[PDB]
Amino acid sequence: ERIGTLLGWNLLEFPKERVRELQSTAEPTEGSYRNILDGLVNLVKEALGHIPDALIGKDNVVMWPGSTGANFHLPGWRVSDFVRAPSRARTELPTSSLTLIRGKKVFGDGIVGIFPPMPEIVPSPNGWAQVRMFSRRGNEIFRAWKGVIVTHPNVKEPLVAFDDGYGVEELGDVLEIHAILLQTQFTAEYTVQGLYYQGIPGWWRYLDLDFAFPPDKAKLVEAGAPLELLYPIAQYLKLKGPNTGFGGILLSPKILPFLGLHGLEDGGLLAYTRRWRPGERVIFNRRPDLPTGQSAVELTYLGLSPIADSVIAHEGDIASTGADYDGDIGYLFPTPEKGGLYMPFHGEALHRKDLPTKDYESGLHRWAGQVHAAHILGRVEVNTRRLLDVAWANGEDVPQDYLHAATEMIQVAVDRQKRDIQWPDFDFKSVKDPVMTDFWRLAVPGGKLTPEGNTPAAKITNRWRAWETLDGYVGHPHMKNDLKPLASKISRVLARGEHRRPGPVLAALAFALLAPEPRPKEVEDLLTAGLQSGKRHAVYDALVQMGLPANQATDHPELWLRLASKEELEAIFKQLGYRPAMEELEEALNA
Amino acid sequence: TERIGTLLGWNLLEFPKERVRELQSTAEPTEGSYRNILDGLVNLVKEALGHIPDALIGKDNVVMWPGSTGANFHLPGWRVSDFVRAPSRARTELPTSSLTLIRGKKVFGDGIVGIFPPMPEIVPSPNGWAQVRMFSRRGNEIFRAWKGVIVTHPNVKEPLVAFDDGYGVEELGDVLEIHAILLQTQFTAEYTVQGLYYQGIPGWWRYLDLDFAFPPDKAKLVEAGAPLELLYPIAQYLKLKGPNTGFGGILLSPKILPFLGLHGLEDGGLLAYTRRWRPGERVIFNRRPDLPTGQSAVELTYLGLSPIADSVIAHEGDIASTGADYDGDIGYLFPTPEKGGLYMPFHGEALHRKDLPTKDYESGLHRWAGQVHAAHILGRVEVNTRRLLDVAWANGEDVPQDYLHAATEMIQVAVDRQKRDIQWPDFDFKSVKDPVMTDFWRLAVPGGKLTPEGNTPAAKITNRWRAWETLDGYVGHPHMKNDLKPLASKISRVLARGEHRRPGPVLAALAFALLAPEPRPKEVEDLLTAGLQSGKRHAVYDALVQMGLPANQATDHPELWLRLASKEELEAIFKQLGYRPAMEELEEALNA
Ligand SMILES: [Mg+2]
Ligand SMILES: [Mg+2]
């Protein structure tokens, strides 16, 4: 459940295709912006007569107080940054508890609290959380903070960075703290964008094929389920790099004295891992990866960070990446000499910070800017990658000027989500043909090797079929040529599982499993509901969640498979003479 | 959830309740009737398995047997019935070598089998209790087993087991496996119809009155000012109540006190985990079932706190007439007559049980037939005795003491026949064919407890409360019938106030007053769709409530919405719809 929600705010969401239709024609102009605002007004007005006061939104989502919800003493537009995020865990401290350290960016630009252990929002005594915090009384909120809270046993008193807050100087009689992201490490893989901007020569030679099964299906695989039950296997394919990095929350060395620790040498970094030794070089990375290559920089690892699951690095060292400490993830990869795929940036970053600023009139205008800028950001990003393909095909490079200009546009597009900045002069150079970037967008949507969430099992085989048609795309000759062995591997895996369908296995299971044990009326009722309405799967998800016993489900093999234990799975597969899926998949990999 | 036996690897089989009820239908206190039931039950099992497995046990419509797989008990087959059927609510394991084995039959009190250091795994309070089954085990063998109550206390340094109250062989396994079958709690302490018939003060019926009991989801509606329409039919939430309530706790022996490092207890006095009485105050002790003589209720002196939570401690000799022991029995304390209690203390103080030839049943199967058969007789004798009181009270007379004694004995043997093959005494049934007040009580207060066992469908509960209109149809004590008239009218006014106040229009109106449903997962859509189309709305809503759907997302299903909404949201919507709170209207009906 969202923050604003728990403050009683209203959440209305639109069909995402409405917003996407609006964005399709967006240009970096005033007239295009205008277009977006108009159509967004239409969506809201159609839904409830007027533009409610203090309304904010992002993409297809809109929220507003009314007077049913809590009230903010900050500009209307600013409040978007506080209401939309999920409250994953909450806690409250009396204003009287608090020590108010003074200075802007005192703990590091984005770190807002430094506290004693707090097992209510932070699992580690020496941990962190990304948070929103509110100084409130009743239904007032006078001052609010967004960013990171650090936790440590050497810290005696809750420290709060006062001047980093938003609102006005007065405080309530509480601090409510919502953790929007709980302490964790982050998967650290190379991305398509990063490989296009800073990848070593011939980086594509080091991509390989892998499988990722959700724990559900991992249990089947481990128990020796047959290939039939993984149909279509494409749903479980992923590319992988030759190694992975470290990923943790990015923190500032400015926190170290507040922990009773010493500072940190220039050019050096700490990280909560023993994978590097003091003295060794590492590649520091922070996303988005920018067209110049400046998102990846070489720094010296100098030892353990005091905070779990974190990277500590100086503002000056990571300025080119555009990083800060309000939730950014810091990734560390091995250097090229040590097997890394990202090359360190050398030289001249655009020294950006302070010039053509200006606020949005209102939450609504801010929302229109976000929606508008989001479209441009993608257009510039994709475009730059297409051009690199066109260039590489010829044997030329895209001029550095362009990469610098594209970068500045990207950075403004991100900025234009917060405030009303002037669009720089940018010539979107056309692209004639399908290029490899178009291929990459099919095969690896979003650019990340670990696929996100949602692709219907119906469409996913088509994605992995694209590897057949490499030769139809303009791009670098060695890239298209050297991808052929990986394309072949992919083809074999698909070919092995094509035509191996689950139907006969589910039918056999129904005959090999004992009669169902006696089950409550609730359960019979749901099961009846599912079958008569053709919504088995909703019913099954329910029953899985409600901890139904395996032996009560044997007349529903699909459901049974989700409740059975290791032992029961192993037994039934042996009884039916199945060859383990994995043996078949290894054979297809290695042929 | 999960029967001990199931966890021991035993097989189980429930049969339709009707197969059993049919055999019981014609049960008589004779060996021939017994053999009827046995032959019937034998058939039941054989239809399923083709044979009666070794070591089968059974109660009512449930049988278990170990088969190829189940734990092997070094105990007579018939005895295992008492260890394998009960629910396993919580479990631990102690190594044999941890235990101190105290010797002597009934050394901790008859029914108490263990005195232990605090054990949060099965007992919530450091000075609490659990009703348990304990098994001395090695691999698949169970050598010795105990049934009864465990007590824990901070003063107890080592786990103490009453070894000689164990059942089976003397060799121990290497683990003592403990299953809690009932967790520490107090128990509702209300007067019953049986208890009032047998021990009630003169005119006890005058002190019964009407009350409401809403389950928490309905109390939420009430407190927020829902309209009477949403309670339809109100009969669902009616109960009778007594003029006062007692204390109910687990019953423990004073023999535990030295083992807790405490001093003993004077004769004639009891301890309980309550401050409601002062040391010195007289109190009425009660143990169920209530027996026809009135001997289930006795006056004892309350002397102070019990060291154990949610418990009552009283002497074997003091409670003998009630037939109580300490293996899980519940002790109830009620105020004396002089202080507004409805139970009179027994003074005729003489049980004196005559000796009836008795021997062990031959097998679990024979014991099962034993309880099935005897459960029927027990029912018949107890109802019948109350009917006889109605007849006598109608004629201005009394049932003779001897009849009460004989009926009590029959009841006791009927209980005992569930354990062992005891001879039936000679008992003249002296049956009653005319409708008597006892028949009214069975309609109005099924089972005799004021707090209804709540498995009557909505469609039938109104008819139950309608029986209050029919008092003239029943022979019994003339003042009982006349004096119940005020209570009957009150019931009548409440039913009539809610009659024709149906929920439909209010549900329809909430659909039009609630905001649009905020966005919801697709599986929630699909579930709701499955419910609508299949006609299983309610199974879906039960699921969605349990999976904790937010109210926000259910506003187009008002029945579901009422189950999810907050106090604030309920109050708000009832105000906007102009409803009068059900409680104001209910109060008006009561007070008219
Ligand atoms: Mg940032
Ligand atoms: Mg007993």
Whether residues A375 and A463 fall in one domain? yes
Helix, strand or coil for residue B509?
helix
A-chain CB neighbours of B536 within 8 Å are 525-526, 528-529
* Å between B2 CA and nearest CA of chain A: 11
A-chain CB neighbours of B519 within 8 Å are 11, 13
Identify the burial level of B192 via C-beta atoms within 10 angstroms of its C-beta, where 0-12 means exposed, 13-18 middle and 19 or more buried. Answer: buried
Alpha-helical runs (H) found in A395-519: 400-415, 436-443, 460-465, 477-482, 484-497, 503-512
Candidates B63, B518, B527, partner chain A, best to mutate (most A CBs within 10 A) = B527
Q: Are B454 and B446 in contact (CB under 8 A)?
A: no
- Helix A581-589 to helix A215-222 angle (10° resolution) is 90
Rounded alpha-carbon distances, angstroms, from residue B154 to A125, A151, B158, B260: 32, 38, 10, 8
Q: Are B390 and B379 in contact (CB under 8 A)?
A: no
CA of A12 to the centre of ligand 1 (A): 27
**Rounded distance between C-alpha atoms, residue B251 and residue B285, angstroms:** 11
- Per-position DSSP letters for A166-178, written without gaps between them: EE-S---SEEEEE
Under DSSP, the state recorded for A189 is -
Cβ separation of A525 and B519 shorter than 8 Å? no
Side chain identity, residue A168: V
3-state DSSP of A453-482: CCCCCCCHHHHHHHHHHHHHCECCHHHHHH
- What is the sign of the dihedral through the CA atoms of B166, B171, B172 and B178? negative
Pick the last residue of a domain from B165, B184, B203: B184
**Rounded distance between C-alpha atoms, residue B142 and residue B5, angstroms:** 12
Q: Say how far residue B519 (Cα) sits from the centre of its chain.
A: 45
Give the number of other CB atoms < 10 A from CB of residue A536. Answer: 17
Identify the residue whose tokens are 């009214």.
B440
Rounded alpha-carbon distances, angstroms, from residue B370 to A258, A313, B210, B416: 78, 80, 40, 10
* Å between B525 CA and nearest CA of chain A: 9
Q: Are B65 and B81 in contact (CB under 8 A)?
A: no
Identify the burial level of A395 via C-beta atoms within 10 angstroms of its C-beta, where 0-12 means exposed, 13-18 middle and 19 or more buried. Answer: exposed
Question: Which residues have a Cβ under 8 Å from the Cβ of A88 and sit 6 or more positions away?
Answer: A178, A179, A180, A181, A182
Cβ separation of B550 and A518 shorter than 8 Å? no
Helix (H) or strand (E) holding B391: helix B364-394
Show the CA angle centred on residue A355, arms to residues A350 and A360, nearest 5°.
Answer: 120
CB within 8 Å of chain B, chain A residues 516-555: 518, 521-522, 525-526, 528-530, 532-533, 535, 537-539, 541-542, 545-546
Q: Are B384 and B453 in contact (CB under 8 A)?
A: no
CA of B323 to the centre of ligand 2 (A): 8
- Per-position DSSP letters for B395-455, written without gaps between them: TT----HHHHHHHHHHHHHHHHTTTSEEPPP--------S-BHHHHHHHHSTTSBSS--S-
Q: Is residue A487 part of a domain?
A: no
Residue length, chain A?
Answer: 591
Name the residue among B14, B540, B547 with its Cβ closest to that of A518: B14
* Å between A478 CA and nearest CA of chain B: 45
Q: Is residue A34 part of a domain?
A: no
CB within 8 Å of chain A, chain B residues 1-60: 14
Here the tokens at position A448 are: 């990340």
B-chain CB neighbours of A538 within 8 Å are 523, 526-527, 529-530
**Rounded distance between C-alpha atoms, residue A265 and residue A88, angstroms:** 36
CATH classification of the domain holding B252: 2.40.40.20
Show the CA angle centred on residue A167, arms to residues A161 and A170, nearest 5°.
Answer: 75
Q: Which of B375, B198, B350, B354 is nearest to B286 (CA)?
A: B198
Helix (H) or strand (E) holding A268: strand A268-271
Nearest CA in chain B to A544: B547
3-state DSSP of B230-242: HHCCHHHHEEEEC
3-state DSSP of B176-198: EEEEEEEECCCCCCCCEHHHHHH
Backbone angles phi, psi at B247, to 5 degrees: -105, 140
Under DSSP, the state recorded for B10 is -
Helix, strand or coil for residue B381?
helix
- Helix A363-394 to helix A30-48 angle (10° resolution) is 130
Q: Are A102 and A83 in contact (CB under 8 A)?
A: no
Q: Say how far residue B451 (Cα) sits from the centre of its chain.
A: 10
Identify the residue whose tokens are 């004590």.
B477
* Å between A357 CA and nearest CA of chain B: 36
* Å between A184 CA and nearest CA of chain B: 26
Rounded alpha-carbon distances, angstroms, from residue A253 to A258, A263, A584, B446, B533: 10, 6, 51, 74, 61
CB pairs under 8 A between A and B: 60
Q: Are A212 and A238 in contact (CB under 8 A)?
A: yes
Whether residues A270 and A307 fall in one domain? yes
Candidates A535, A541, A559, partner chain B, best to mutate (most B CBs within 10 A) = A535
Q: Which of A52, A135, A123 is nearest to A95 (CA)?
A: A135
Whether residues B251 and B326 fall in one domain? yes
Q: Which of A470, A486, A293, A547 is nearest to A397 (CA)?
A: A293
Candidates B10, B536, B540, partner chain A, best to mutate (most A CBs within 10 A) = B536
Q: Is residue A434 part of a domain?
A: yes
Backbone angles phi, psi at B65, to 5 degrees: -150, 155
Q: Say how far residue B4 (Cα) sits from the centre of its chain.
A: 20
Cβ separation of B534 and A537 shorter than 8 Å? no
Cβ separation of A542 and B534 shorter than 8 Å? no
Q: Which of A541, A518, A515, A545 is nearest to A530 (CA)?
A: A541
List the determination method.
X-ray
Beta-bridged to residue A72, according to DSSP, are A141
Binding residues of A for Mg(2+): 324, 326, 328
A-chain CB neighbours of B533 within 8 Å are 529, 532-533
Q: Say how far residue A438 (Cα) sits from the centre of its chain.
A: 22
Q: Is residue A57 part of a domain?
A: no
Question: Which residues have a Cβ under 8 Å from the Cβ of B29 and sit 6 or more positions away?
Answer: B377, B410, B424, B427
Question: Which residues have a Cβ under 8 Å from the Cβ of A208 and sit 6 or more positions away?
Answer: A239, A240, A242, A486, A489
- Helix A521-533 to helix B537-546 angle (10° resolution) is 110
Helix, strand or coil for residue B531?
helix
Q: Is residue A397 part of a domain?
A: yes
Q: Which of A158, A83, A146, A84 is nearest to A120 (CA)?
A: A158
Backbone angles phi, psi at A64, to 5 degrees: -155, 150
Q: Are A101 and A162 in contact (CB under 8 A)?
A: yes
**Rounded distance between C-alpha atoms, residue A109 and residue A105, angstroms:** 4
SS percent in chain B: helix, strand, coil, step 5: 40, 20, 40
Identify the residue whose tokens are 């990722």.
A212
Rounded alpha-carbon distances, angstroms, from residue A330 to A228, A273, B364: 41, 13, 70
Question: Which residues have a Cβ under 8 Å from the Cβ of A25 and sit 6 or more positions away?
Answer: A32, A35
**Rounded distance between C-alpha atoms, residue B425 and residue B232, angstroms:** 50
Name the residue among A1, A532, A542 with its Cβ closest to that of B534: A532
Q: Are A88 and A130 in contact (CB under 8 A)?
A: no
Cβ separation of A13 and B523 shorter than 8 Å? no
**Rounded distance between C-alpha atoms, residue B376 and residue B372, angstroms:** 7
- Starting from the CA of residue B82, give the closest ligand: 2
Here the tokens at position B348 are: 């005729």
Kindly state the greatest CA–CA separation across chain B: 75
Side chain identity, residue A181: L
Q: Which of B301, B343, B341 is nearest to B318 (CA)?
A: B301
- Starting from the CA of residue B148, give the closest ligand: 2
Rounded alpha-carbon distances, angstroms, from residue B28 to B5, B31, B234: 32, 8, 41
Cβ separation of B550 and A1 shorter than 8 Å? yes
Name the residue among A1, A528, A538 with its Cβ closest to that of B527: A538
Strand ranges, E, within A152-198:
159-161, 166-167, 174-182
| Residues with a beta carbon under 5 angstroms from ion ligand 2 | B 325, 327
Q: Which of A450, A453, A439 is nearest to A487 (CA)?
A: A439
**Rounded distance between C-alpha atoms, residue B580 and residue A515, angstroms:** 53
**Rounded distance between C-alpha atoms, residue A340 and residue A591, angstroms:** 28
Helix (H) or strand (E) holding A558: helix A557-563
Q: Are B73 and B404 in contact (CB under 8 A)?
A: no
Cβ separation of B526 and A538 shorter than 8 Å? yes
Give first-to-last CA distance, chain B, whole Å.
47
Q: Is residue B23 part of a domain?
A: no
Show the CA angle centred on residue B435, arms to residues B431 and B439, nearest 5°.
Answer: 90
B-chain CB neighbours of A537 within 8 Å are 523, 526
Helix, strand or coil for residue B131?
strand
Q: Is residue A549 part of a domain?
A: yes
**Rounded distance between C-alpha atoms, residue A413 and residue A424, angstroms:** 10
Beta-bridged to residue A240, according to DSSP, are A208
Pick the last residue of a domain from A134, A153, A183: A183
- Per-position DSSP letters for A219-237, written without gaps between them: HHHHTT--GGGG-SGGGGE
**Rounded distance between C-alpha atoms, residue B38 and residue B60, angstroms:** 12
Whether residues A440 and A375 fall in one domain? yes
A-chain CB neighbours of B527 within 8 Å are 535, 538-539, 542
Q: Which of B215, B212, B244 is nearest to B491 (CA)?
A: B212
Question: Which residues have a Cβ under 8 Å from the Cβ of B430 and sit 6 or more positions away?
Answer: B384, B388, B403
Whether residues B105 and B178 fall in one domain? yes
Cβ separation of A537 and B546 shorter than 8 Å? no
**Rounded distance between C-alpha atoms, residue A481 and residue A471, angstroms:** 8
HSE value, Cβ hemisphere, 13 Å, CA-based, for A567? 1
Nearest CA in chain A to B2: A549
Here the tokens at position B469 are: 């209109």
Whether residues A457 and A539 fall in one domain? no
Peptide bond into A232 cis (omega under 30): yes
Model resolution, angstroms: 2.4
Backbone angles phi, psi at A292, to 5 degrees: -75, -25
- Per-position DSSP letters for A356-396, written without gaps between them: S----SSHHHHHHHHHHHHHHHHHHHHHHHHHHHHHHHHT-
Beta-bridged to residue B137, according to DSSP, are B142, B175
Cβ separation of A522 and B529 shorter than 8 Å? no
Kindly state the greatest CA–CA separation across chain A: 74
Q: Which of A240, A175, A237, A234 is nearest to A497 (CA)?
A: A234
- Per-position DSSP letters for A18-87, written without gaps between them: HHHHHHTT--SSHHHHHHHHHHHHHHHHHHHSS--TT-EEETTEEEE-TTTS-EESS-TGGGHHHHSSB-
CA of A172 to the centre of ligand 1 (A): 27
HSE value, Cβ hemisphere, 13 Å, CA-based, for A402? 16
Alpha-helical runs (H) found in B224-321: 256-259, 316-319
**Rounded distance between C-alpha atoms, residue B282 and residue B341, angstroms:** 12
Candidates B7, B13, B523, partner chain A, best to mutate (most A CBs within 10 A) = B523
The answer to whether B413 faces chain A, any CB pair under 8 Å, is no
**Rounded distance between C-alpha atoms, residue A362 and residue A367, angstroms:** 9
Q: Is residue A81 part of a domain?
A: no
Pick the last residue of a domain from B308, B338, B368: B338
State yes or no: B329 annotated in a binding site.
yes
- Per-position DSSP letters for B35-82, written without gaps between them: HHHHHHHHHHHHHHHSS--TT-EEETTEEEE-TTTSPEESS-HHHHHH
* Domain assignment of residue A105, given as a range: 86-183
Under DSSP, the state recorded for B518 is P
Domain count, chain A: 4
